Amino acid sequence: KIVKYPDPILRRRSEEVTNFDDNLKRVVRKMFDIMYESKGIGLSAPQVNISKRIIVWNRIFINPSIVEQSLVKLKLIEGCLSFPGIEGKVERPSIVSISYYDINGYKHLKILKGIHSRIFQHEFDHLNGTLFIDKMTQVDKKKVRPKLNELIRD
Ligand SMILES: CCCC[C@@H](CNNC[C@H](CCCC)C(=O)N[C@@H](CCCCN)C(=O)Nc1ccccc1)C(=O)N[C@@H](CCCCN)C(=O)Nc1ccccc1
Ligand SMILES: CCCC[C@H](CN(O)C=O)C(=O)O
Ligand SMILES: [Co+2]
């Protein structure tokens, strides 16, 4: 199961992974399993109730950072596994420059674009307690407000 807004776990700052061992491997496999089951394109650890800096998608990014971006930004409609039935436009840089660690603890530097850039940014935010509604266009926010209220109500 995936945790839903407005659960407060989603609002915490996830903690850096320090042990790149067997627990980590198990946690990451669990994340993939849950992701495949939910037919998600990606998943962050907080969304399965683990407050650790881990993101996966269909590879693995541990303790990621985003450290630069294109001038070009665009709005794309996003959904989020933590917000059933909710969609809206989010403006983000087209291209981002990132760093992260792999399952063995080696550091990697990468530039992401297109779809990977988008997914990565959305998931990265989860690790910081930031949710896509926080960054949604004012118009789409309003359109989705009644539905957010209902999510809060249950
Ligand atoms: C209804 C207005 C659509 C406005 C469009 C704005 N610019 N879209 C450009 C993107 C290019 C991908 C960005 C890296 C595009 O061409 N999107 C296609 C779907 C691409 C599928 C990739 N597996 C799209 O929205 N096509 C479409 C077809 C028919 C009607 C409406 C839209 C947009 O935000 N599309 C959304 C999908 C909307 C789902 C339909 N209910 C989108 O591409 N979001 C998204 C992209 C990448 C990661 C996460 C989310
Ligand atoms: C725009 C990112 C989509 C990721 C979302 C899952 N999710 O909320 C990841 O954080 C999905 O697969 O639909
Ligand atoms: Co999400």
UniProtKB/TrEMBL annotation:
UniProt source species: Plasmodium falciparum (isolate 3D7)
Keywords noted in UniProt: Hydrolase, Iron, Membrane, Metal-binding, Protein biosynthesis, Transmembrane, Transmembrane helix
Family: Belongs to the polypeptide deformylase family.
Gene Ontology terms describing biological process: N-terminal protein amino acid modification; translation
GO cellular component: apicoplast
Role according to the record: Removes the formyl group from the N-terminal Met of newly synthesized proteins.
EC number assigned by the record: 3.5.1.88
Span of the entire protein shown here: 66 to 230 of 241
Reactions accelerated catalytically: N-terminal N-formyl-L-methionyl-[peptide] + H2O = N-terminal L-methionyl-[peptide] + formate
Residue stretches in coiled coil: none
Gene Ontology MF annotations: ferrous iron binding; peptide deformylase activity
Membrane recorded as keyword: yes
Protein name as annotated: Peptide deformylase
Top class in the EC scheme: hydrolase
